[PDB]
Amino acid sequence: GTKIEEGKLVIWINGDKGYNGLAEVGKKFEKDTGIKVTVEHPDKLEEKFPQVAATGDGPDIIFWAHDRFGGYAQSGLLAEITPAAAFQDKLYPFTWDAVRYNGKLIAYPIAVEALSLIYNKDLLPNPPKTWEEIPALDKELKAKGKSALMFNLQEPYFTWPLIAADGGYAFKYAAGKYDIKDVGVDNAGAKAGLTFLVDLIKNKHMNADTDYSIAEHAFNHGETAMTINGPWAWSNIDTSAVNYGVTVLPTFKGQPSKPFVGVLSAGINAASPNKELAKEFLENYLLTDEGLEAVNKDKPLGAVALKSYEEELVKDPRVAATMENAQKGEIMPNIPQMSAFWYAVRTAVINAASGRQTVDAALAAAQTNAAAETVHCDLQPVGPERGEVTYTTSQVSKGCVAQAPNAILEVHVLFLEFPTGPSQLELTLQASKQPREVLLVLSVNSSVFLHLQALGIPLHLAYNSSLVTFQEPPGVNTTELPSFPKTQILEWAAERGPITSAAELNDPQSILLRLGQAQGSLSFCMLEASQDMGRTLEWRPRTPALVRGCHLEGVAGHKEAHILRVLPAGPRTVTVKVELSCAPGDLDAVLILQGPPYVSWLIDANHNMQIWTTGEYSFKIFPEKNIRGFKLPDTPQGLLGEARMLNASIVASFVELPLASIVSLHAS
């Protein structure tokens, strides 16, 4: 995972999309502006983004169907989109409606996705028009060693068209609003579609464990005559020798299959310093005939939101079929509750298809699990002038800690990466309790002025003399760092001695390295993503956390709530420093500290404020006096509600951080 860096763009998009073409567009944008663009497709990126954006990192731009973005915007994780009317006129209005949340545009619409029925012409010159005739057809095809239909059953998105065919829906829309207390997952028609699916699996016309890979591999090799998929899937079929047609989904109970219409959208991370660059890229490069053509060449986008290129794409009969099915379905709601809904429906379908539940029990349960938490406010990013949060953590982008029994020399490796320009770094090596000599290998990404503190350590240095400049240089204990890739640097260093710790740090402001603190028993040091270095390494990153806040409506008086939520495995004391500036002589404020059960809080504040925490807390002035905490809500909205209970009209600070040792908050 590439961290955010000012002057560059990170982009997340699902692994089934045309990220190759999108990266091509990024190479164009880089050529023009000199801004590099890194496109990646992490697994479950839609569930990862909300957690990662709150820490300040994550992609500058996230690509996903609109249904999720509402959630993100409720948590204050997306910047407001303010395109010029001239640009707004270039895309269809309804695609803008998809990205409308509380009157604000939260993303850019890209494409319009809808599932279609893909069939093999050689196997099925005349594909059935109804679900009901599929079984009778699968008998005939199984006689020939084939199957009628195979599509992904592990995601409710693919099976929804049949559930919704009769009276099935997610959230009823009326009076210009979605009613979150009205859900149509457990109704009769949904039960009928899902019961017909369960009847297909029950008769061995489909395999309950079939997934995306199984269905794609099966259809591309001619094992099955039919599959259900979206535009993105046509490319891999083109490579295959299969002669395929793309047409309207079958009817169920005489009614057309209603797929959920998605709108591939690009949201701009509220933690991004490159917002203006992301708007430039999305508006003037990605959304053009050329850009959308480059992406669509890799993986078809379906119908694009951009009108000029849509007028060309509609000439594709496959896109025409996508539109035909989309016209019969329902654009997904974009509300924050959709996530929960999806989870529920998922576990329902699965459990109902595996036989663990009856359709009735599975769907009733779905209706109950879809219930979402109470929302107390819409969070909003807070600017630097209002508040700033800096912290020290033990977590690293990549890291490893290991023990070296009997080793006469131990090796520590640091892969340090910095943005453009000279950077300043403080590095301190802390001696272990007692003669073992140490090797420090530090490779740097740019020029760095370094304060190295190593006291009573028989230390050897390995670095680049041209990039690293010392405030206090040593004369003799130095080795010129060879220019290898990182893995080869690790092996080169291992040729001198075993590696006890290694870490890749992005734009570190300060670093502390503790010798002889090796945790557990691990003899080989292997880099793992998002590793917790424990006591071995503690560093202060330069990028600050994402601070958020809001106003709690219907709450009298002026009372500020400052919330810090530490994210999740042993007893840990988090130091929390609070500096409130321009605070009135008498200020009513509360500090809410939420974290796992194993976290104690050590509080130091320049102001006298209420204290509301989990676990236990102690003031920095009274180390050994322990005050037991309360049981606090786990969710962000839960904590906001706890703030409302405390008569807080204004949430001044809201921060979410992982595995933090020290946390300094500042608010004015």
Ligand SMILES: OC[C@H]1O[C@H](O[C@H]2[C@H](O)[C@@H](O)[C@@H](O)O[C@@H]2CO)[C@H](O)[C@@H](O)[C@@H]1O
């Ligand atoms: O199944 C739950 C899932 O449904 C939708 O995800 C789609 C997505 O819209 C398509 O672009 C493509 O990636 O297929 C996905 C299903 O595998 C929702 O957009 C998503 O929020 C939800 O998790």
Ligand SMILES: *[C@@H]1O[C@H](CO)[C@@H](O)[C@H](O)[C@H]1NC(C)=O
């Ligand atoms: C530092 O590394 C990051 C990612 O590895 C890269 O984007 C950036 O350009 C590098 N800095 C320099 C000065 O090359």
